[PDB]
Amino acid sequence: AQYEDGKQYTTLEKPVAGAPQVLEFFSFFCPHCYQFEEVLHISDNVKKKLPEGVKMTKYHVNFMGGDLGKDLTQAWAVAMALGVEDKVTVPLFEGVQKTQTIRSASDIRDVFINAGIKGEEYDAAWNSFVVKSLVAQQEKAAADVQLRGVPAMFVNGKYQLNPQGMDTSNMDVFVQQYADTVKYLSEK
Numbered sequence: 001a002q003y004e005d006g007k008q009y010t011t012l013e014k015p016v017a018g019a020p021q022v023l024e025f026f027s028f029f030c031p032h033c034y035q036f037e038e039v040l041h042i043s044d045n046v047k048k049k050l051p052e053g054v055k056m057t058k059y060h061v062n063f064m065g066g067d068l069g070k071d072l073t074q075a076w077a078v079a080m081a082l083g084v085e086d087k088v089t090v091p092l093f094e095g096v097q098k099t100q101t102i103r104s105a106s107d108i109r110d111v112f113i114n115a116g117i118k119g120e121e122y123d124a125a126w127n128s129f130v131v132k133s134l135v136a137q138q139e140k141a142a143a144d145v146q147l148r149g150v151p152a153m154f155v156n157g158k159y160q161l162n163p164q165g166m167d168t169s170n171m172d173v174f175v176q177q178y179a180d181t182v183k184y185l186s187e188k
Contacts, residue, residue: 007165008181012158016144019157020057022046022182025142028072028096029064030150037093040175042151049179050186058085059138065096071105072096077134078112078125087115123133155185 003013024043026033036042047056060076064068072092079085091111095102102108112122125131145154153161166177 002187003181003184007162009155009162009175009185010160012145012160013155014146016154016157019144019154020141021054021156022050022056023141023145023154023185024056024058025061025147025150025152025154026058027061027064027069027150028092029069031097033151034093034097036151037089040171042175042178045175046153046182049183054186059141061142061147062139063148064143064150068103068105068108071108073138074126074131074135075112076107076185077131077138078122079136081125081128081131082117082121084112084115084117087117088112091115104166153182155182157187159185159188161185 003009026036043056043058050056060073062073065072075088076085076091079088088111091114092102093106095107095111102111109122109126113119145152145160146159151163155161161178161181163174163178166174166181168174
């Protein structure tokens with residue numbers, strides 16, 4: 001075939017019912033995740049090729065960066081609750097991996113303040129039970145699907161993208177192949 005199990009995707013031997021359609025995992029500590037966001041714009045190009053009425057979900061993970069990794073998963077919960085993903089993603093990435101100015105929860109908070117979220121509103125979100133369950137959601141979904149590596153994308157809780165089995169000479173070709181693969185898996 002042109003798309004083969006084990007080549008551009010693997011299949012979960014234990015499928016995850018009730019899963020979000022397109023589910024993506026990342027960590028602000030994850031170097032390929034940085035590329036995926038800043039250089040490749042994977043999420044965005046996948047979206048552009050998906051049907052619509054297709055929900056796209058992105059979650060942070062705990063297993064990188066110890067204590068700060070968990071702070072970042074709670075911070076990403078705040079970002080999702082406030083709808084400000086598109087305003088903090090880049091400075092969180094650069095703060096962790098480029099400038100290395102994020103070392104504490106307070107430094108994470110600074111990024112949100114600078115992006116214009118109000119102090120009171122951030123701290124209230126940070127401490128809210130809506131955010132707590134949004135942290136639990138991120139953890140449960142990672143737990144449902146065996147997750148030991150990022151970046152990772154799952155489609156309908158059954159198919160996992162396998163970018164190792166795609167071409168990397170051309171960055172644009174890689175992205176298109178990746179997005180086309182998600183679309184193919186989507187209509188499966």
